[PDB]
PDB file of C-alpha atoms and ligand atoms in Angstrom:
ATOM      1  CA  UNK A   1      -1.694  11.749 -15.317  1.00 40.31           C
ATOM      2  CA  UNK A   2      -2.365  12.690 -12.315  1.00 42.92           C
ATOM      3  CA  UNK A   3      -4.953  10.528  -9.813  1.00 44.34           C
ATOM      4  CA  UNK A   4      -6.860  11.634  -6.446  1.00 42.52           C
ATOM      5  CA  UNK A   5      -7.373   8.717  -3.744  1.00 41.18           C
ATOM      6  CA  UNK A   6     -11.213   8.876  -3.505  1.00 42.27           C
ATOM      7  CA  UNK A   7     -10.990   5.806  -5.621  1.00 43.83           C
ATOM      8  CA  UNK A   8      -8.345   3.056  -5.242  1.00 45.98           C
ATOM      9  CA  UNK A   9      -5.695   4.011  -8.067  1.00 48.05           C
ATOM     10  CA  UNK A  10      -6.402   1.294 -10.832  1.00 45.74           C
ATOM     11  CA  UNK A  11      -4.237   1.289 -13.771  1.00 44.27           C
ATOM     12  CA  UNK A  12      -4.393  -1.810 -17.188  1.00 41.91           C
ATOM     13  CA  UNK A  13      -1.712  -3.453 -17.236  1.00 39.48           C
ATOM     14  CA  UNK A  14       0.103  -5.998 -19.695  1.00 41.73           C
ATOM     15  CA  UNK A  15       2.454  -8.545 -18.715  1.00 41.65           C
ATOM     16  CA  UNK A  16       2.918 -12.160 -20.104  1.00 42.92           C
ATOM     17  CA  UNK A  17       0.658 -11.288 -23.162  1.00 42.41           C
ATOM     18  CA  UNK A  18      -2.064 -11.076 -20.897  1.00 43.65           C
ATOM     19  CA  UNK A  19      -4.335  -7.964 -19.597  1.00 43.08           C
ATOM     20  CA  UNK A  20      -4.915  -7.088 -15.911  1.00 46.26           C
ATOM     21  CA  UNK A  21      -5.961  -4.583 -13.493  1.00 46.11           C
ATOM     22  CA  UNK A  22      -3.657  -3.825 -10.590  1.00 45.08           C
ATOM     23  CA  UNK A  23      -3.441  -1.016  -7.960  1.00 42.62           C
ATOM     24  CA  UNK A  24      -0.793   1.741  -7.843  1.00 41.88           C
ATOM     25  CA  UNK A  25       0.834   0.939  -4.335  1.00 43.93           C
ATOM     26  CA  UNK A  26       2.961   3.235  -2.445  1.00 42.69           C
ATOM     27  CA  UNK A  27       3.671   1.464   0.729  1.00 43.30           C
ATOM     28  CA  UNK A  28       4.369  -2.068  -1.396  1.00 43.05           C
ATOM     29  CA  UNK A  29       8.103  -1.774  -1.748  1.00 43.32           C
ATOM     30  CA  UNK A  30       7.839  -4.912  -4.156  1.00 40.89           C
ATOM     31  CA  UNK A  31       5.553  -5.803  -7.191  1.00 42.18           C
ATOM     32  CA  UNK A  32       2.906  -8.924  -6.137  1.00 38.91           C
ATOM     33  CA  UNK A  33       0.876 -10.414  -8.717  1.00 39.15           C
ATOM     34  CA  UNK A  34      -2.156 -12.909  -8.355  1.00 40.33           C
ATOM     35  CA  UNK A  35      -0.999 -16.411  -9.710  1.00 40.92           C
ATOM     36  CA  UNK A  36      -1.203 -16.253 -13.448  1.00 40.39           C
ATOM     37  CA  UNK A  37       1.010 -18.018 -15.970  1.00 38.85           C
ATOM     38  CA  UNK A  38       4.638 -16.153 -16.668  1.00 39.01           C
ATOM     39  CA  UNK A  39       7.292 -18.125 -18.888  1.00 38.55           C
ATOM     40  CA  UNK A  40      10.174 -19.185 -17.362  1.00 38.10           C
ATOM     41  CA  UNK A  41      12.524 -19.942 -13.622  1.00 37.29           C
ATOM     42  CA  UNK A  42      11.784 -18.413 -10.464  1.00 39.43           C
ATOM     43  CA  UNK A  43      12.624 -18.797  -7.235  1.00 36.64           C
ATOM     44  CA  UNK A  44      10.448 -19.087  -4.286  1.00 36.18           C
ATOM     45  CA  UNK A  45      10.493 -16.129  -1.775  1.00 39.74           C
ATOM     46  CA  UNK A  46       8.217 -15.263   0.813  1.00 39.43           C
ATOM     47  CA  UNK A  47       7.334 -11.859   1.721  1.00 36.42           C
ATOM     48  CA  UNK A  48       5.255  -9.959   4.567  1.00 34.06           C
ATOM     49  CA  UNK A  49       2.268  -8.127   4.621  1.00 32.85           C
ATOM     50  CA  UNK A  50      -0.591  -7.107   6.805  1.00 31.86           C
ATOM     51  CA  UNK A  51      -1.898 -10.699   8.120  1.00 29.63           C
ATOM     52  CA  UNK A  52       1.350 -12.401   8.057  1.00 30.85           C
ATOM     53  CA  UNK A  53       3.612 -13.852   5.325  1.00 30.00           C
ATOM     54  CA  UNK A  54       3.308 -15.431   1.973  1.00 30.04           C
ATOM     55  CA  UNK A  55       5.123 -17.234  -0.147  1.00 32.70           C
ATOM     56  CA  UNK A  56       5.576 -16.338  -4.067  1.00 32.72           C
ATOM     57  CA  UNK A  57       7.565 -17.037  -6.950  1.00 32.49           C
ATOM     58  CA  UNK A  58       9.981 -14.601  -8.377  1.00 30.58           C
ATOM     59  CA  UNK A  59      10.459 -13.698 -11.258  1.00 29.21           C
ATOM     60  CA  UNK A  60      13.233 -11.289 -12.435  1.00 29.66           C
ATOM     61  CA  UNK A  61      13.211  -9.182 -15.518  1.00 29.87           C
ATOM     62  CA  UNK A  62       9.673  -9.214 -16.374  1.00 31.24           C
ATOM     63  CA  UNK A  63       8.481  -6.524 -18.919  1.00 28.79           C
ATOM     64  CA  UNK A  64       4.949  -4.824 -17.584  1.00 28.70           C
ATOM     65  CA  UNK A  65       3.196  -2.232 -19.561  1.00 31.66           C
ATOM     66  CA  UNK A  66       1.287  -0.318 -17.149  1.00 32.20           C
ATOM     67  CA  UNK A  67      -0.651   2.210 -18.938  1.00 32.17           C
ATOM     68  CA  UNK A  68       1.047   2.815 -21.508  1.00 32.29           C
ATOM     69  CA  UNK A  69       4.525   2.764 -20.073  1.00 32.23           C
ATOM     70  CA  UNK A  70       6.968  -0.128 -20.279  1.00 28.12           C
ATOM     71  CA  UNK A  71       9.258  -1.008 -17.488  1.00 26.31           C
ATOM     72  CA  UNK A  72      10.931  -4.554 -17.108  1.00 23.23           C
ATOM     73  CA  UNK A  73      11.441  -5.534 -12.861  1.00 25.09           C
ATOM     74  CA  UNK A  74      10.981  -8.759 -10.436  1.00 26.43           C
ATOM     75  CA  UNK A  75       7.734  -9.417 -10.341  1.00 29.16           C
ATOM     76  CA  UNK A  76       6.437 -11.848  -7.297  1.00 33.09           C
ATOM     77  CA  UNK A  77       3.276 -14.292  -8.113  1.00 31.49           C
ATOM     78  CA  UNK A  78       1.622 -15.320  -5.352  1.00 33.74           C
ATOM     79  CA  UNK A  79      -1.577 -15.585  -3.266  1.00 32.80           C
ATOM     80  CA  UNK A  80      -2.691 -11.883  -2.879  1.00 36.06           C
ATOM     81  CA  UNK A  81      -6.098 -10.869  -2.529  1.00 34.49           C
ATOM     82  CA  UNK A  82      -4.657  -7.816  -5.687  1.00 34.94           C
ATOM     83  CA  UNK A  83      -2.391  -7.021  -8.012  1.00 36.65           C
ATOM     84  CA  UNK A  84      -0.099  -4.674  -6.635  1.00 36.22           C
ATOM     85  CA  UNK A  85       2.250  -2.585  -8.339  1.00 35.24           C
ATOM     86  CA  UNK A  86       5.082  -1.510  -5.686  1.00 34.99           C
ATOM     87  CA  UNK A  87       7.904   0.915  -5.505  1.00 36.01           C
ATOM     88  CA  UNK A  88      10.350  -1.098  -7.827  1.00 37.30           C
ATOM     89  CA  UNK A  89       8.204  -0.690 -10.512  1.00 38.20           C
ATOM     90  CA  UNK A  90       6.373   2.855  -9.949  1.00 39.95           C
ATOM     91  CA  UNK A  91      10.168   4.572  -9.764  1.00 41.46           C
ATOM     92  CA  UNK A  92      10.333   3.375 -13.612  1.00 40.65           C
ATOM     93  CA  UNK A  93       7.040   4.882 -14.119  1.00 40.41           C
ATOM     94  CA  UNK A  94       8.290   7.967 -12.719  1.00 42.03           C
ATOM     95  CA  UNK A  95       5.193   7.961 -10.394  1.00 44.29           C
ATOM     96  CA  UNK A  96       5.338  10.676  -7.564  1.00 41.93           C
ATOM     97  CA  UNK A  97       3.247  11.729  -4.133  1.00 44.05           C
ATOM     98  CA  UNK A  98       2.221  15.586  -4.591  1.00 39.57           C
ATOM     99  CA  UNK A  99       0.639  17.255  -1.477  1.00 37.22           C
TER     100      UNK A  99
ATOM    101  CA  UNK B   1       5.683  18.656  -1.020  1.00 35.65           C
ATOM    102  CA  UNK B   2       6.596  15.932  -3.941  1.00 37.24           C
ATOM    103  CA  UNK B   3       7.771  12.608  -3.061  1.00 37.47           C
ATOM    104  CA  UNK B   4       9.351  10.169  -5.590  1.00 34.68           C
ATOM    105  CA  UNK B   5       9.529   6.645  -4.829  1.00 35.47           C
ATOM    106  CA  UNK B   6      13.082   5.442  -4.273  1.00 34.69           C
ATOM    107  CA  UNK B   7      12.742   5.767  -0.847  1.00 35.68           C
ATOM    108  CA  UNK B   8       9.862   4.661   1.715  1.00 38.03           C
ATOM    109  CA  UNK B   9       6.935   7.599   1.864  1.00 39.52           C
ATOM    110  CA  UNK B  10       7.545   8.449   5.481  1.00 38.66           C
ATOM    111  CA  UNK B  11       6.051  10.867   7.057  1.00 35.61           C
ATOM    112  CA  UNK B  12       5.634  12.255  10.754  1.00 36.51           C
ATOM    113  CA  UNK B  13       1.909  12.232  12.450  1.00 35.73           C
ATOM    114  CA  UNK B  14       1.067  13.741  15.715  1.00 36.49           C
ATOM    115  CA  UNK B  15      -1.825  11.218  17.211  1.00 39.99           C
ATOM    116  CA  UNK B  16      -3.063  10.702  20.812  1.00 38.74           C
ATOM    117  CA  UNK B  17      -0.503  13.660  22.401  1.00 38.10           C
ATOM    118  CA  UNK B  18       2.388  10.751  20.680  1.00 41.08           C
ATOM    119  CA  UNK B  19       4.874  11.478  17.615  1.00 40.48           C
ATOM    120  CA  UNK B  20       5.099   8.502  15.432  1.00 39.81           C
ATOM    121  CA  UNK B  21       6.012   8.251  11.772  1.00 41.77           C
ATOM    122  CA  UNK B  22       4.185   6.476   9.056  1.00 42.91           C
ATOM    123  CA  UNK B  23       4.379   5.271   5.716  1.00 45.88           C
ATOM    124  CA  UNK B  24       1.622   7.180   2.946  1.00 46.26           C
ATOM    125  CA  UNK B  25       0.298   4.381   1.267  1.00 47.54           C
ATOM    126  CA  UNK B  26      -2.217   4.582  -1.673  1.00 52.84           C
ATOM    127  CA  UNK B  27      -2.829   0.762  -1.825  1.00 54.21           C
ATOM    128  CA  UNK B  28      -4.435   1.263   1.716  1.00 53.67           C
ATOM    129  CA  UNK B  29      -7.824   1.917   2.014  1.00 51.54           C
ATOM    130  CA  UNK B  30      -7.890   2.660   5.483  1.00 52.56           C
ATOM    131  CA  UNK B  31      -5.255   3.579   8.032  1.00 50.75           C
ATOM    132  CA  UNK B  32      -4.075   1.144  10.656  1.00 51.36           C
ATOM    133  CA  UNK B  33      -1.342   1.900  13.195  1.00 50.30           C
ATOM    134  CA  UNK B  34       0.476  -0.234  15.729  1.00 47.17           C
ATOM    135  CA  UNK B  35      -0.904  -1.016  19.112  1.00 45.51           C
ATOM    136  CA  UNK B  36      -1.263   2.769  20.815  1.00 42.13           C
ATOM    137  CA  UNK B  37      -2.875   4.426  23.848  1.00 41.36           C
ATOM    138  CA  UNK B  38      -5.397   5.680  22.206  1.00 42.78           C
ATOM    139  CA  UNK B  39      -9.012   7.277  24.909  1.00 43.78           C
ATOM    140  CA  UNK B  40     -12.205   6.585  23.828  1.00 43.07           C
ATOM    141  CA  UNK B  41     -14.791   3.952  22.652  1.00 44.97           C
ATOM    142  CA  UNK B  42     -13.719   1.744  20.301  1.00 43.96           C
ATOM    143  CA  UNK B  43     -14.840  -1.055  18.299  1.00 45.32           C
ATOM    144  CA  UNK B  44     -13.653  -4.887  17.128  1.00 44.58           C
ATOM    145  CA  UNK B  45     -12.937  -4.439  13.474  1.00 43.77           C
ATOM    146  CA  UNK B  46     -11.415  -7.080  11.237  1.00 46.17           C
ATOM    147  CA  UNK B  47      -9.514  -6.598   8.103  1.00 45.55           C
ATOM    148  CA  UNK B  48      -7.173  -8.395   5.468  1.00 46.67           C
ATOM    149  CA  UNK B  49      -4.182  -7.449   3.918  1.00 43.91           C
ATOM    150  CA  UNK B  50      -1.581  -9.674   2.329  1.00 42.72           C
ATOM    151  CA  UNK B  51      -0.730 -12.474   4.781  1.00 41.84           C
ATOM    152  CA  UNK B  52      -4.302 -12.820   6.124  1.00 44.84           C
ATOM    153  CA  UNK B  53      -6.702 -10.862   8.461  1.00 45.92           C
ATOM    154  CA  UNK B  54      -6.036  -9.225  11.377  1.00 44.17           C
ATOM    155  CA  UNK B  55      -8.522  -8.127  13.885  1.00 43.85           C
ATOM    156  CA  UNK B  56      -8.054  -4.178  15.182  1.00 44.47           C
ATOM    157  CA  UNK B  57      -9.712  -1.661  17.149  1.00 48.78           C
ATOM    158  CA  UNK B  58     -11.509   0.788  15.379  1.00 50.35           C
ATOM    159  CA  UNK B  59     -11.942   4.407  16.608  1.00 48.64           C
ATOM    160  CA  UNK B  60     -13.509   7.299  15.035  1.00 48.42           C
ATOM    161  CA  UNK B  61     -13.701  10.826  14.817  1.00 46.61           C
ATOM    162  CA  UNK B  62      -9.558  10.763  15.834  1.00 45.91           C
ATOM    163  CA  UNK B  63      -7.543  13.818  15.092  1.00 45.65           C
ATOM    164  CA  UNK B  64      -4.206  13.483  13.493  1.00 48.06           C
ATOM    165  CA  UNK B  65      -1.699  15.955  12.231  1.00 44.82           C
ATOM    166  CA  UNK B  66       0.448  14.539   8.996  1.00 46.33           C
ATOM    167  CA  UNK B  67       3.019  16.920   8.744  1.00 47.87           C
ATOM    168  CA  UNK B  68       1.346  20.040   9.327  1.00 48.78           C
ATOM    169  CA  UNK B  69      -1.841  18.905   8.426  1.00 49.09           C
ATOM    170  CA  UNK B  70      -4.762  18.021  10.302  1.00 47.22           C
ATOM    171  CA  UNK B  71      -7.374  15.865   9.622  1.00 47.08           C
ATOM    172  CA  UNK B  72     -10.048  13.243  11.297  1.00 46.94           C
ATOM    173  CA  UNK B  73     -10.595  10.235  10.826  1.00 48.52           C
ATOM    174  CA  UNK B  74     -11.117   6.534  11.737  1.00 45.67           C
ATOM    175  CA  UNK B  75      -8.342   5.194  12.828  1.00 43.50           C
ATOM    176  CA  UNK B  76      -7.762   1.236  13.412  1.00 40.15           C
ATOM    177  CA  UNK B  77      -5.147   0.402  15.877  1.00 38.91           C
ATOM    178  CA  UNK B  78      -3.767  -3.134  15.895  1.00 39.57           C
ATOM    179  CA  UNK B  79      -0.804  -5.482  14.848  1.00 38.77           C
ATOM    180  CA  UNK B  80       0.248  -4.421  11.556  1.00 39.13           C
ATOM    181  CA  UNK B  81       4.226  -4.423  11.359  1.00 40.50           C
ATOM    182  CA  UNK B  82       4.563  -0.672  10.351  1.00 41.11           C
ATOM    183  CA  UNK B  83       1.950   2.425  10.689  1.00 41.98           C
ATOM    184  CA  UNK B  84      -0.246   3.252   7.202  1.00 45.40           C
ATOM    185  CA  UNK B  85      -2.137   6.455   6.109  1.00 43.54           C
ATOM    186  CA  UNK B  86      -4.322   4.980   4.127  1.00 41.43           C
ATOM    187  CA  UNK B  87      -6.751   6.747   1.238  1.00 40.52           C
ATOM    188  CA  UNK B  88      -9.242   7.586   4.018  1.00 39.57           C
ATOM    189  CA  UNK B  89      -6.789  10.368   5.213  1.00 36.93           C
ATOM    190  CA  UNK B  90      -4.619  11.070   2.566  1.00 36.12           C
ATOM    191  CA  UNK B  91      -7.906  12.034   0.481  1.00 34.33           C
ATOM    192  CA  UNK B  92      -8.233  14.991   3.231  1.00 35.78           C
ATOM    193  CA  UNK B  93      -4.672  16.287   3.154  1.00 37.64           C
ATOM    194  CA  UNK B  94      -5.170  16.846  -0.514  1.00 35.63           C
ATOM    195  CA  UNK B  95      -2.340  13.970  -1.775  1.00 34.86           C
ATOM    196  CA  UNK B  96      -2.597  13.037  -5.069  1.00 35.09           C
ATOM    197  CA  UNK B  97      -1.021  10.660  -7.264  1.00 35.44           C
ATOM    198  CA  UNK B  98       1.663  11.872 -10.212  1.00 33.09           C
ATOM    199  CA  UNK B  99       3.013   9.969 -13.355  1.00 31.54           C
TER     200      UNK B  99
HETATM  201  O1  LIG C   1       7.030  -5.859  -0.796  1.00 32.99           O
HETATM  202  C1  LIG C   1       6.240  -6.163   0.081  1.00 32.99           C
HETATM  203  N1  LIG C   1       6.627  -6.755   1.230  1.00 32.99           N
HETATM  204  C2  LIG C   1       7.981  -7.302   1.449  1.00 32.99           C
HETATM  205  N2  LIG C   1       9.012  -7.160   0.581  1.00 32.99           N
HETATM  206  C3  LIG C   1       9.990  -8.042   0.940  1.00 32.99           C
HETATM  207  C4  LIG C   1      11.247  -8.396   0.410  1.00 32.99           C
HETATM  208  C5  LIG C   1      11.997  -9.427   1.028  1.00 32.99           C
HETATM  209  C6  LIG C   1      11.510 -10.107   2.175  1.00 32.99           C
HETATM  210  C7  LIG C   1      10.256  -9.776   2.746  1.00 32.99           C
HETATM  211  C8  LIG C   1       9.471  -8.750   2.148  1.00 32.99           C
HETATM  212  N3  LIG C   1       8.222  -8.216   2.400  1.00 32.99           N
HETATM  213  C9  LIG C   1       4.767  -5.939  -0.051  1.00 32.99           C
HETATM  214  C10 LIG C   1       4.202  -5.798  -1.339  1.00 32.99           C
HETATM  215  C11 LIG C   1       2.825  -5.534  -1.481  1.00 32.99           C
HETATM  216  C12 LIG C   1       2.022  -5.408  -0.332  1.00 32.99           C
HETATM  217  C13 LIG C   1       2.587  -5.564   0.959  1.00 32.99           C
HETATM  218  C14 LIG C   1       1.753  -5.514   2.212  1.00 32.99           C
HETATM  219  N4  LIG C   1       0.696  -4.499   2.233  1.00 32.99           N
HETATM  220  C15 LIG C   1      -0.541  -4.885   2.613  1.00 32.99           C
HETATM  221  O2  LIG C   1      -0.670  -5.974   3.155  1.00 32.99           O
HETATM  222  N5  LIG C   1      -1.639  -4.108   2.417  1.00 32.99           N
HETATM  223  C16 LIG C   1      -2.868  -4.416   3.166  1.00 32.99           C
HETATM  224  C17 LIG C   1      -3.564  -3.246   3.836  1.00 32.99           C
HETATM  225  C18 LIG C   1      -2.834  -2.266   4.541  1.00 32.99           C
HETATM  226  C19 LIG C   1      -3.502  -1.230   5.219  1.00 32.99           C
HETATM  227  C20 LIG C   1      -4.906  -1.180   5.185  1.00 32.99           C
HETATM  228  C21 LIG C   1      -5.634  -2.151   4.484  1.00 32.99           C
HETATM  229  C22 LIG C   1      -7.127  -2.095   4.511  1.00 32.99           C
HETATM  230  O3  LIG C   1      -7.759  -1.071   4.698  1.00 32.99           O
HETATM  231  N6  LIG C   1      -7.713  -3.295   4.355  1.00 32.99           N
HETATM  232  C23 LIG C   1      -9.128  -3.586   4.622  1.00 32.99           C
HETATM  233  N7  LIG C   1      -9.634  -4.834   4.536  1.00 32.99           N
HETATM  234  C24 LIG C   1     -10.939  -4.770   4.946  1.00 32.99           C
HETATM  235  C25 LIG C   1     -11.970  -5.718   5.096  1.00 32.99           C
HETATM  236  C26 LIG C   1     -13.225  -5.297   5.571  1.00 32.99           C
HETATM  237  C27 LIG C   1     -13.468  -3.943   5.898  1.00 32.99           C
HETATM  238  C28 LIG C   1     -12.468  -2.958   5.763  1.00 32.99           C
HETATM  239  C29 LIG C   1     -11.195  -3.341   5.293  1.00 32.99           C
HETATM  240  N8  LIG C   1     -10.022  -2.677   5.060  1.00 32.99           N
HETATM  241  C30 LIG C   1      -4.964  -3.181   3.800  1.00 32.99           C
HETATM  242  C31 LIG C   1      -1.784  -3.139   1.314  1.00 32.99           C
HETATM  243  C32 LIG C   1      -1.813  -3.905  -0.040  1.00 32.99           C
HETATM  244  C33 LIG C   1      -3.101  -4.659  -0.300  1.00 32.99           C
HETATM  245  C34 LIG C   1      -4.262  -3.942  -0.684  1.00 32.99           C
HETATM  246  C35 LIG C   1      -5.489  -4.621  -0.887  1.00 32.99           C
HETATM  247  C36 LIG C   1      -5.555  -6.023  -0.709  1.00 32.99           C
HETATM  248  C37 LIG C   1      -4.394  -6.744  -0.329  1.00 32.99           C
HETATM  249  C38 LIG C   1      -3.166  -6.065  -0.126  1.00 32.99           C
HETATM  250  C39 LIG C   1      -0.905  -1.903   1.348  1.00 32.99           C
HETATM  251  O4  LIG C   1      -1.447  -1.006   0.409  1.00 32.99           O
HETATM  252  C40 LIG C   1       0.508  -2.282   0.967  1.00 32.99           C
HETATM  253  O5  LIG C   1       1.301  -1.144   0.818  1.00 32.99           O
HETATM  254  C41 LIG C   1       1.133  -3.089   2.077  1.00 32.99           C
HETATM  255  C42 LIG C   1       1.136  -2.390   3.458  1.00 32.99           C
HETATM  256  C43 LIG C   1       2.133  -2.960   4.441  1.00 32.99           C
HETATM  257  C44 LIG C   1       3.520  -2.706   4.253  1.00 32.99           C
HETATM  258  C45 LIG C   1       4.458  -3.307   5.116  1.00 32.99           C
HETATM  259  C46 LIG C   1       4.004  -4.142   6.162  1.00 32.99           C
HETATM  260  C47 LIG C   1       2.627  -4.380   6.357  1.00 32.99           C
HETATM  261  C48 LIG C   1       1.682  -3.792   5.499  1.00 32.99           C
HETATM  262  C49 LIG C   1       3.957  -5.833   1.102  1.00 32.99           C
END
């Protein structure tokens, strides 16, 4: 569908058999999750944002449902403030910028 | 124009007589651009991203072209690693979001 930017782009997601809400992120080139339980081995990363770096646990070939769409990517679980969905996962979606 | 994600969404702003480019992010809520001669009054602002908070200077009423597009708007100016058009501006150049 498409979504204007009065309001912060929210979109349901599923992942792990649980339900979240989580922000459609154009400038996030990766997927960051708030710490929630996924099955499995990850490794530990860290990654940068505004404020400074973090460090989060990857995990690779993780199947989201975001709206209704299904799309299996790394997904990083760390201390963010939001769930952000980033460009590896919004390509899958076939999201796009229109103006 | 369209713009899919498999690339960063950079674009080119004219701010402060000074070509930069800039990356059109929907996760933002308000733009913040590296440290820049900007005139004017400003004000302390503080603000958090991923990684912490950062403290910026906030200036308002700023004109800045986006491609060919003007608009006005706040502007912070401060130490993030990479210049943001955040949904402040991008809701006047008309962008919208596509899947
Ligand atoms: O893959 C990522 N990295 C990366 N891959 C790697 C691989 C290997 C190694 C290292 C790596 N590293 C990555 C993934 C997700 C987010 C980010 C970092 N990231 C933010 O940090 N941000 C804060 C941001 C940016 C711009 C403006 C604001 C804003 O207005 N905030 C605000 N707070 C306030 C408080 C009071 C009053 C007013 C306020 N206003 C906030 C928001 C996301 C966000 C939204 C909400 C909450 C938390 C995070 C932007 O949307 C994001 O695109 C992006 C912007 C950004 C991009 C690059 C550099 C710096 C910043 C990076």
């Amino acid at each position: 569908p498409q979504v204007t930017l009065w309001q912060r782009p929210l979109v349901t997601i599923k992942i792990g058999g649980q339900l979240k809400e989580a922000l459609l992120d154009t400038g996030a080139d990766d997927t960051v999750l708030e710490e929630m339980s996924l099955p499995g081995r990850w490794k530990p990363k860290m990654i940068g944002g505004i404020g400074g770096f973090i460090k989060v646990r990857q995990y690779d070939q993780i199947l989201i449902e975001i709206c209704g769409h299904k799309a299996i990517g790394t997904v990083l679980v760390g201390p963010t403030p939001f769930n952000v969905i980033g460009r590896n996962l919004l390509t899958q979606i076939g999201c796009t910028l229109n103006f």
